[PDB]
Symmetry: D2
Subunit: 255 residues, 4 copies
């Protein structure tokens, strides 16, 4: 099942879409500068691009870490990003009441992994009618994602993306089960599956070289998109991902 | 570090405290009946007791599933439990705005494991000044429980209970690391550690397994045991707790080495 | 099901048996000195005791690390331990051909975890008719132990002990699933289950306090025995204090009927 | 570091080598038939090929289950495979004393994962001087493979292949850490790394899974693949080769 996000087609058989940006919105000027860099590199390679940022991030590592500019200013910034670059945007929500006003502006709304069982939030997100990115908890098996999907369906929204972020592996560490992508596709109606490589590595060319190996591995399994918190470095990385993706997506799925 | 909860002393070298009750509040009369049974059993065995229940099941598998009586009716039921039996109570909270009204009534407020990184909820819980029960996420190592403790300390509340509920073990299965209790004591300032045996087992009769697991955890010298009955059958409660108390008494009588 | 090992009754409802000793037999006099300490302490507390050591340690951290005294001298040392102290002994075997000579001398023979799928070894061990200790691999689930037991049964030997040593938990780390003991009892005909606390902790960074916590926890589930190693591994002088606490818990647990 | 195996170059920046065959040797004719199919498919796709089989099933569910032809008959069959097809072969050894006679015939000898810490077997294997395939235990971290390599080096053999077979993931299940390949390269002197897809999946249709997993691992840039595996082998290898050729043509970053 494909999802149209303005002029982008997101689907496990379509050219991969990059989801990237910055962690938390600080100002219009800094957001535009970072967005402009992603836009320039992705335009140069022809890769569809969706800008990601939080306006109020509720799960930072310290209680006094800046959570972002907040809803009202955050949405003004997203409006300007959309107007300037003509791209879709994605942000996370954690309060039911925030879902509607965010969905006026942001093309995709993201359900944080740890909140993915929270019924009130799921319902409020579903009822926006927007495209939703469901972050897969590290403690949920891929065959259980169908249960979250079911709750969105009961609440009237099928425009759902499944986002892999790794699985708990002993203490501290995460492993990405490359078989889980296929299990999600088979059990969840071939909804678009995207790969959050950055979180999948947080517990581990150094880190750059790891992120490349892990991203290539995941994309080899035929995915709708790649998701980062992460210059000539981005360009070189995307060149390699686009090469693999083009090869994979050009071949028919097996008989 | 011990914590006083009314007349109860909760601590890792004190007689164990039972946090027991039910999954979700459904009605006044059924709650009072179940609570009466826990009270009469615990009082005769001389085990300190705190009644547990949720007023809302916030994360059920269907949007149409029964969720419980809800906050307003739930707090009325807890007020009646306290007035009738004179015991402390514990319940979980899922949103910041609920923390102040719940804390006015409920002696211990609980941080659900999946929500333990939500800064807004940690701050709202901390600011109540109530005793807080921190459910340890299944995906968090025992040496990282200190990170959750740190956040509560930064928000000005040190009356914290660390509650084991198992660790993720492959897909859809949990294992309880009996060594993690010690790690949590050593790295979190010897705050009271309790063991949620019920949720530790949910992924795998079960009566015999609950007893074996509970006895194993309590062997490591813990402040308390956390469990649910309807979950153990309610009539086996007395026999179960006779065994747990026999082991706790023995362990607690041996000098720490 | 109980197993008699000379005058010792080994079983999940009997007073726990200590299997203890050393990693590798390296000398006569030092072995006897270590054994003498375990004997003195276990006699003092009334705990049944079986002396454990390897005569050939197959899994050394370097290839030229001393393997141990080898089969022929190793068996002589075991004979001396038996003659001097009057206790049973346990050792591991690695090859079919070693099963008969080791079984003539040793009261229990042990199937190393990594070798537990080797059919030739399982048959040769079974055919000795000796009591066998089966080490549970860290990568085998407790419900799979029955398949090793089945093979011993097909080969005509039911005098089997099942020995927990932990389960793989992420990379280079072990957890002991306290529920596995019960799964093994239920699926393997209530054969004696013992706990190797030493090898269950090898991947953890003191260590004395960990060994005690882990040992108590396991013994709380009602087990036939505890399996450990010391060095002159627990320090050998702390043995009495450790065993006092284990015996206290075991006596309490064992004195209460199983809860139906 | 590359390893020459007759005319094949095995290395993490070389075209991938397929190691494939059957579980256990049962008879000459059935072995030749299976080998012929692999040879025909790999030749027409231009993929270097090493035939794999066990002469002994050391590891069965009944004491009365079939064990395979055994060492002496097994080595006769391997000699015939080599003579007929002119390809290298690989087999596993489980006891020190088998290492020299097996190594006289088989180009690559394989150290079973469960036996990888058995010092006597490591030394006996090393002393043959043959190419050795070291199966990574499902319980060992990739950064610990360097300690096995060190033992083979101390024993005088550096012609070592590291082989991924998955990692224990709770009870009765395996997961493959796609980051472990890189860790093994970085810490073990860029010895060839190959991927045993078959044994990585044994605890998990299945054909589609094997393809996804094989594509994912080969994306990390590897020397070779194990595939025990309508024309399924051919269809699978076509896709693997396309991805391998692409990956191997990109400069290392
Ligand atoms: Cl998560
Ligand atoms: Cl709870
Ligand atoms: Cl959890
Ligand atoms: Cl041992
Ligand atoms: Cl093992
Ligand atoms: Cl293995
Ligand atoms: Na004997």
């Amino acid at each position: 099942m494909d999802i149209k996000i303005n002029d982008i087609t997101l689907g496990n058989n379509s050219p991969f879409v990059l989801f990237g940006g910055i962690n938390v919105l600080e100002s219009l000027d800094s957001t535009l500068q970072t967005c402009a860099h992603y836009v320039e590199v992705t335009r140069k390679l022809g890769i569809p691009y969706i800008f990601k940022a939080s306006f109020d991030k509720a799960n930072r590592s310290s209680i006094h870490s800046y959570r972002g500019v907040g809803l009202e200013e955050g949405l003004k910034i997203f409006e300007k990003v959309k107007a300037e670059f003509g791209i879709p945007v994605i942000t996370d929500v954690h309060e039911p009441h925030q879902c509607q006003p965010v969905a006026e502006v942001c093309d995709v709304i993201q359900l944080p992994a740890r909140l993915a069982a929270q019924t009130d939030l799921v319902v409020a997100m579903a009822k926006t009618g927007n495209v939703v990115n469901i972050k897969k908890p590290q403690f949920l098996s891929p065959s259980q994602m169908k249960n979250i999907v079911e709750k969105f369906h009961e609440a009237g929204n099928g425009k759902l993306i499944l986002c892999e972020r790794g699985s708990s592996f002993g203490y501290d560490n995460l492993v990405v089960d490359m078989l889980g992508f296929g299990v999600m596709k088979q059990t969840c109606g071939n909804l678009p599956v995207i790969f959050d490589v950055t979180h999948s590595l947080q517990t581990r060319g150094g880190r750059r070289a790891q992120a490349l190996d892990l991203a290539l591995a995941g994309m080899a399994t035929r995915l709708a998109g790649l998701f980062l918190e992460s210059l000539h470095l981005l360009e070189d990385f995307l060149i390699r991902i686009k090469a693999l993706d083009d090869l994979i997506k050009s071949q028919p799925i097996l008989t």
